[PDB]
């Protein structure tokens, strides 16, 4: 399973597909040159280097060794781009996994680009944290923190479509045989698929809330169990659907912080935002409470089981799911 993981890496075309994201790119090259001190002459570790973008950011911002680690076969792909562009002397490809390598000193500064989808996903978060053994004390982080934002949504057309789908199954004959009996199966196993798509904030009826996890302070423990309590203020009245979810992170460097957001007021990324729809819709005036958890727990496939939790205080209308962030929903 973390086989099929690093092979899906080694693709250029998978590169591609990040690079050519503007916002992605464009922000990190802002965040490192725009804080060209935190880079002039320092030891920069690359974590999950790709094609080794971020090491030749933190060349042009002046860092005299950068150690680019990656573990697909994309590490062969980054080291010719060392050579063809005359760097060999400043960047050092090591292949391999952060956990296993062996740096040759400590650096002053991680740089990575481990966000998943609604941050967590693909769990790289870990190795970055992990890559923390090689940090100076009073090394910096790049990014320097996270923050997952939560928010009740209203869509009764996703939420219909989930069952006009699984209703395939609800037919005494289809052929012959009847299938009724699978319905209710087709029907959990589509609702378990978080939802890849951006929306209309206007679907949006409380304000989000934020779940921050700094990148100096965490250890790599604290992210195989995320509690994130909610207590939602309601704007507007109407069905709640489910929560909706992004993230942004900032790169908090000596001459300023910079932001990466994927918000769905701010334009698009290849991360999009993701939804988790409730089993069961939930009545909420403007003025209720909606108040619940988000519990996630990381699984075996390089992911997330998601359980979320919710009730209208007013009313004790209830509600719940349990999803599974590896097998998503690509809406778009
Ligand atoms: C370097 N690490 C970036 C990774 O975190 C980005 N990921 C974003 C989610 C979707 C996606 C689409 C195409 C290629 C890769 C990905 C994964």
Redesign the pocket.
């Known amino acids: 399973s973390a086989v099929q993981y690093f092979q899906?890496?080694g693709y250029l075309s998978?590169?591609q597909?990040?690079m050519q994201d503007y916002v992605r790119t464009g922000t990190y090259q802002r965040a490192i040159l725009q804080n060209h001190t935190d880079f002039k002459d320092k030891i920069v570790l690359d974590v999950?280097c790709?094609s080794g973008i971020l090491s030749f950011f933190a060349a042009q911002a002046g860092a005299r060794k950068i150690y680019a680690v990656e573990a697909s076969t994309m590490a062969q792909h980054a080291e010719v781009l060392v050579k063809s562009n005359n760097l060999t002397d400043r960047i050092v490809v090591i292949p391999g996994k952060v956990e296993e390598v062996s740096l040759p000193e400590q650096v002053d500064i991680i740089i990575?680009?481990?966000?998943?989808?609604m941050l967590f996903?693909?769990r790289?978060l870990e190795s970055y944290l992990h890559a923390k053994k090689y940090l100076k004390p009073s090394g910096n982080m790049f990014p320097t923190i996270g923050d997952v934002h939560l928010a009740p949504f209203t869509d009764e057309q996703l939420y219909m479509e989930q069952f006009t789908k699984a209703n395939f199954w609800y037919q005494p004959s289809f052929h012959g045989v009847d299938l009724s009996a699978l319905r209710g199966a087709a029907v959990d196993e589509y609702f378990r698929q978080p939802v890849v798509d951006t929306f209309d904030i206007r679907i949006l009826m409380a304000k989000s809330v934020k779940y921050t996890v700094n990148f100096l302070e965490a250890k790599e423990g604290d992210l195989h169990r995320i509690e994130i309590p909610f207590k939602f203020h309601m704007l507007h009245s109407g069905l709640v659907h489910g929560l909706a979810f992004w993230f942004d992170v900032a790169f908090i460097g000596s001459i300023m912080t910079v932001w990466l957001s994927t918000a769905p007021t701010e334009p698009l990324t290849?991360?999009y935002q993701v939804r988790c729809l409730f089993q069961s819709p939930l009545f909420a005036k403007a003025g209720d409470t909606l108040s619940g958890t988000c519990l996630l727990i990381a699984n075996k496939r390089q992911s997330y089981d998601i359980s979320i939790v919710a009730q209208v205080d007013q009313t004790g209308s209830k509600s719940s799911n349990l999803l599974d962030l590896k097998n998503p929903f690509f809406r778009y």
């Open positions: 899906f890496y998978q590169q597909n990040m999950g790709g990575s680009e481990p966000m998943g989808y996903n693909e790289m290849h991360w």
